[PDB]
């Protein structure tokens, strides 16, 4: 199972430090989008 599991992570896009940066980007992107949406209705 340890070998079988390892075989998976190499053929698929492996986790990378950039992925978390993409996550905090996509997350922050929606945070910026969320706050942007809020002010749109206030105006």
């Amino acid at each position: 199972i340890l070998e079988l599991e390892a075989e998976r992570e190499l053929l698929n896009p492996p986790p990378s430090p950039l992925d978390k940066k993409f996550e905090q980007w996509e997350e922050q992107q929606a945070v910026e989008a969320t706050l942007a949406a809020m002010k749109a209705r206030r105006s």
Binding site: L18, K21, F22, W25, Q28
Partner: protein, 104 residues
């Protein structure tokens, strides 16, 4: 020899069997070129993603990610360039053979 006129009609028919052979090989060479073009499109797209991962890094001043993404991009762009270099080479080959076939 056989009836010379019979050979003329018989022979010219044989020659047609070859012109198609060149035609198929000529066309088959096209698939190799355009196939790499999609691969190059994927490679530049993968590079384009990487710059997009660097363009998202461009925003908010996350330069080191624009650095790593572009740094990895160059490897993929070098592959893209390598595919592009191969595509450029194939472009001349297909054109001259078409001119040859058009001439032939």
């Amino acid at each position: 020899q056989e009836a010379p006129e019979d050979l003329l009609e018989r022979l010219l028919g044989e020659m047609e069997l070859e012109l198609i052979e060149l035609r198929r090989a000529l066309a088959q060479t096209i698939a190799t070129f355009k196939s790499t073009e999609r691969q190059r499109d994927a490679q530049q797209l993968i590079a384009q993603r990487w710059y997009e991962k660097a363009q998202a890094a461009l925003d908010r001043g996350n330069e080191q990610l624009a650095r790593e993404a572009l740094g990895q991009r160059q490897s993929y762009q070098s592959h893209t360039e390598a595919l592009g270099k191969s595509l450029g080479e194939q472009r001349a080959l297909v054109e001259q053979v078409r001119g040859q076939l058009q001439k032939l």
